[PDB]
Amino acid sequence: TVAYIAIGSNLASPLEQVNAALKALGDIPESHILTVSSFYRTPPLGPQDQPDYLNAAVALETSLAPEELLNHTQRIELQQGRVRKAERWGPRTLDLAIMLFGNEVINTERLTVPHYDMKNRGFMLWPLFEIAPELVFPDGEMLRQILHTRAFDKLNKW
Numbered sequence: 001t002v003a004y005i006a007i008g009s010n011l012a013s014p015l016e017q018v019n020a021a022l023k024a025l026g027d028i029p030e031s032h033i034l035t036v037s038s039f040y041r042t043p044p045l046g047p048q049d050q051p052d053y054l055n056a057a058v059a060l061e062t063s064l065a066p067e068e069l070l071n072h073t074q075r076i077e078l079q080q081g082r083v084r085k086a087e088r089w090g091p092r093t094l095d096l097a098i099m100l101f102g103n104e105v106i107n108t109e110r111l112t113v114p115h116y117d118m119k120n121r122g123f124m125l126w127p128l129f130e131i132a133p134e135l136v137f138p139d140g141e142m143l144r145q146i147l148h149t150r151a152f153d154k155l156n157k158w
């Protein structure tokens with residue numbers, strides 16, 4: 001199964017963390033990276049005093065179950081990132097989001113795939129489109145059609 005994972009970091013100096021997270025994704029059992037998007041830079045949500053966000057998409061080949069993949073992505077978040085004391089129960093300094101898991105629709109207490117809001121997020125769709133321009137969502141909507149119709153601005157490269 002090809003899973004598509006969104007990497008987000010809000011560290012002032014995120015490259016070391018992001019590269020560590022990429023290596024860690026590869027170390028996941030029964031899984032390996034197929035490709036990684038360019039790194040993209042987007043404005044911090046709210047006040048602009050905060051560093052830019054680093055955004056990227058990863059194609060991960062895997063034979064794990066979706067929940068098993070989630071276990072590992074959560075572990076990597078714990079090991080490579082930290083709580084943001086400004087929003088403790090929100091995203092950590094490193095966020096790994098499972099955007100898509102093959103053509104599967106998954107709804108559980110701990111996991112919703114496709115990611116519940118990704119179709120509204122240029123910062124998730126653009127890096128995904130770079131590595132998977134022909135992508136079709138489980139409901140049959142085309143990634144390319146969403147980007148074109150919604151007219152999201154392109155992102156700046158890191």
Ligand SMILES: [Cl-]
Binds near residue numbers: 012
């Ligand atoms: Cl920078």
Ligand SMILES: [Cl-]
Binds near residue numbers: 081082083
């Ligand atoms: Cl911490």
Ligand SMILES: [Cl-]
Binds near residue numbers: 114137138139140
């Ligand atoms: Cl869908």
